Design a protein around this ligand. Sequence first.
Ligand SMILES: Cc1cccc([C@@H](CC(=O)O)NC(=O)c2ncnc3[nH]ccc23)c1
Length: 167
Amino acid sequence: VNSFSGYLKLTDNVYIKNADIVEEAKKVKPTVVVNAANVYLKHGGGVAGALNKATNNAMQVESDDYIATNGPLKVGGSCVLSGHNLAKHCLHVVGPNVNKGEDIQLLKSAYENFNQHEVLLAPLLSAGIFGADPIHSLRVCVDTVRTNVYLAVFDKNLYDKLVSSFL
Ligand SMILES: Cc1cccc([C@@H](CC(=O)O)NC(=O)c2ncnc3[nH]ccc23)c1
């Protein structure tokens, strides 16, 4: 039993809810919140910009030190950093950005990072400003993640389409 409430169950291990991942994180305080990161951990917009703003820029400060030490992530890769006031940890995961020409096949690799964590609160990878089809992102999620994932979809119209079209 966990504290996530109001989700629609899609599969044994994948759940979905129309919610702002920021407000969901502040309420649940999950062990892991997933950020839709880029390779530079520049949290300027989208989910990343929203999560970072909610940390009063502490996420960005921590991320800049991480990059200065370690260099950029790989597309499809991840790193674990602090969750600040939102969660114990933040798993920064880089899905391919279609508006940069990156191989959509890397979306499966991106979701594989979730399997290193028993429970996660997460967005749909490569959706929104990353340019991929969110219906496709959801399919890859369900077919790749085996741990328990609670998906927050900010757009209500997108949420209803994802549910109604799910096979
Ligand atoms: C990868 C990527 C980039 C850009 C945009 C999105 C969309 C996709 C959608 O609508 O779910 N989601 C969000 O931006 C989002 N999701 C949950 N909680 C949130 N809080 C504030 C914003 C926000 C996704």
